[model samples]
Target: KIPNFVVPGKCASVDRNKLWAEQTPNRNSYAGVWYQFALTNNPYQLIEKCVRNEYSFDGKQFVIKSTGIAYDGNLLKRNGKLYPNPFGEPHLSIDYENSFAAPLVILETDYSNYACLYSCIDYNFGYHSDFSFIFSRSANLADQYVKKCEAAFKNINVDTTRFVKTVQGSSCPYDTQKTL
Candidate 1:
């Protein structure tokens, strides 16, 4: 019998029951620098692998610092899933100009090398948009880990081909802000 990797792909069955969940990980595991390895959208680019992940002062909010993006909000944690704040109602600061609120479902992570995340908006209207991310501890994570991340998505039929490879270490500008 064929075993389900992370449930079936095409996601119809999974989404029908809203069963997408986090596969063993925690917010504390998201510390340090994790390079954006693959992204589903081109417009949402990570500059020089410049996305910063920081937890809030009281450890209640997760702050994500990026280019023109500041997502510092409370997070709802369940079994293993992570739901960012401004829940239900989508706010400009929480998301882009206009988008549905979706939880960031963790699929795989060692809290050391790589992390695989997925999210989908199952709106009652007439649409469903999916987003995904694969991050690494370094600029270039080994092929083994990268391949494993891809397979995790492919196993669930999440369409890994559309994930664009991000340019990490190029002739990019470095952060110059410093204290005198």
Candidate 2:
């Protein structure tokens, strides 16, 4: 018997159960410098140590910038290049100069305290990638909030056991590149 050949573009299924949005519950409260404390398991695994994501909004627009220690232990930074997209509330769509844009969302937050961010991209052939990052106003957040963030991930079907703790410290040198 001859084997059946599957088309490259044939997709088996799509999973979009996780909730996300375009506008934050409170835009002003959510806009600020966020230090990365932990990250859920993901395929790309871009930022690892001493990472930060800064955000700004002007009532109608949202902007973001990210910084992290490169894999080689050098400072690496990326500026947000935004574009118009229909990424509904709590979700901010942004593009980077060197990388393609992705939908960023404040999944959960307390404004002045901790926040959880979720982003994902879907590709053809049923391939989809997603990630979650826990951020705090300061480099180090209390354990209570960290546990809260971990629980939130479970609600969205994310595996919290695979979270990778990020390093945060004032001793880490910043990139010379312009940061917002």
Candidate 3:
């Protein structure tokens, strides 16, 4: 319950037969800002979902500390316990099939200025998760920053190759390049 970084400590089980999925508060597509989410595939049939109750942004990433919820009822256990059906696990299946919003590292445009990394801990399983902002101050990550992020993920045994591309729409959403 301590607020620092999203941490889902260890894996409790593995569904080699089950496919990966990305669930969110989103109905059709996922909506996020100053943050990034990734998965191997979308599990539409297992039919898990996610949502954000209330959230805030520091102009960089959304910090969802007090309000977040999720439920992966499909994850069945030998004892008949659902994976995230009850909520709170040491390590979740990234099935975050429910909904959650966690702030991420500081603005890349601001340099290594602050912690933009987002973290969450599953009180039950002692597991956690961490994410970083891809876009920096320069519209894209410089080679140096890319190297740093890659090394960080590698050091933690995370697959940096799965990193996906993120889109940043114009701040105005409806305006063209401003004229001088």
Candidate 4:
């Protein structure tokens, strides 16, 4: 509930409307392969869809090649709200190069599959902790796009029963990336 939950007009930018292939997201529309079935809690309690995230942009900076762990970033657009502090309702901002930086709101997508993301890490003075993601590019995802990514996280009010289900059965690990 503290991830700058959007209720201020359903969050959508660029020319202000007309959504569909809506282009504004950067880092090449979030690079490639992603499939973290669901998350809101579970700080790696194991079996998080066997961890899968292989983003990789390099026109400036971006790297999160995961199956285990690794992160590096810089993809900021900053639509509104204060990032790295001040509640943050980021439509884009993941400046982590050394650490500490968050907010990447993208509640819903059609980049050929499904997506819903939101992040938070204020921890400045009021203590904040909110992170949610429901992605799919493969890994057997098809429950109507996981209920449209849990109704796009309940239309941004979050609390989709606290999500946190990322057990992708089938033993996981499919196309184990190569290091381009």
Candidate 5:
């Protein structure tokens, strides 16, 4: 009973076990605020910029809070808000209200320098989409880190052409003293 749904090609398949990184990320080290430096095109196109996600673990589950400047398509204005998107054990399944459980695979992460998150979620319309993001401890990251993520995307068969860099400069409101 899906309405206004468009069928996608072969780019959306996600094999969780295959994509998992060799080294396990330290849950504690990965916790804290992560600034999205680059993101693959997906359902969040309306989320204009200043995208940031906060994470905390309780040994069994992860509490994820995401904040960004969103474009209200109906209102035709910008909205800055947070969405409650949490995850449970294994740290691969992301649970967001009213949406299909998304697989959040930590493709690579040192837990302190950089992290690459590969995720996929099915839309209410019965179609699935994939998204990948590169995060850094700081708002901006070094070239090597960026290249590392780009290479990962290439190896995974993700479309790197759609990757958009998040706005983290002065335009994005944040406290300089805050450290992740």
Candidate 6:
């Protein structure tokens, strides 16, 4: 369940597969993220399991399970239809519908570091080394969206104004996947 949800067999590279597999056998190596909260002490015990899931193309909408769990409504589904990202040009984008009433603006920076874990858990955490953003949706996101996202982070004890870098001409590496 973990590997399939986190990494796809068809798309994930050999290196990626190995990385996750190594972590699988280890009990303490796993850190789970649920919305803005990072349950470090005992994430597995806290959240029972992934019940259901859905994805989005644009800012349209997605539906996961109805199980009573507060999750990041903004999760970008792996292998789901995507468009040119809007945050950092050469970015990826997905819009959370107004219907999503939870904290859906979750981003994953560094999952393999204690500093990042401490930051979020303590409300002093910053972005992790690896960054994957969740957009509201669309390729050409209005400047307002950027400010809004950054602003949300800024207000919520995260300083996102300084380190943002824009990119252009990001072509998906279909080659990164092994087509069976």
User: Of 2 and 6, which scores higher on TM-score?
Assistant: 2
Worst 10 residues of 1 by lDDT: 73-82
* Predicted structure 1, TM vs. truth: 0.60
- Give candidate 4 misplaced runs (Cα > 4 Å): 1-33, 36-52, 55-63, 66-92, 95-102, 105-115, 118-134, 157-177
Judged by lDDT relative to the true structure, which candidate is superior, 2 or 5?
2
Clashes of 2: 9
Query: Would you give me the overall lDDT of model 3?
Result: 0.30
What global local distance difference test value does model 5 have? 0.63
Global lDDT of model 1: 0.50
The candidate maximizing lDDT is 2
lDDT of 4 by residue, 105-145 (tens): 66667777878776654444544556677878876678898
How many residue pairs clash in each candidate at the backbone level? Answer: 2, 9, 33, 1, 0, 11
Model 5 RMSD to the real structure? 6.2
Clashing pairs in 2: 21-89, 21-90, 21-91, 22-88, 22-89, 22-90, 22-91, 23-89, 23-90
Q: Which of the numbered candidates is closest to the native, going by highest TM-score?
A: 2
Q: Write the number of the candidate with greater lDDT, choosing between 1 and 6.
A: 1
Clashing pairs in 1: 9-156, 9-157
User: What's the TM for model 5?
Assistant: 0.70
| Candidate 3 stretches greater than 4 Å from native | 1-116, 123-132, 168-180
The TM-score values for the models, in the order shown, are 0.60, 0.72, 0.34, 0.26, 0.70, 0.26
| Better by TM-score, candidate 4 or 1 | 1
Q: Please list the C-alpha lDDT of all candidates, in the order they appear.
A: 0.50, 0.65, 0.30, 0.55, 0.63, 0.26
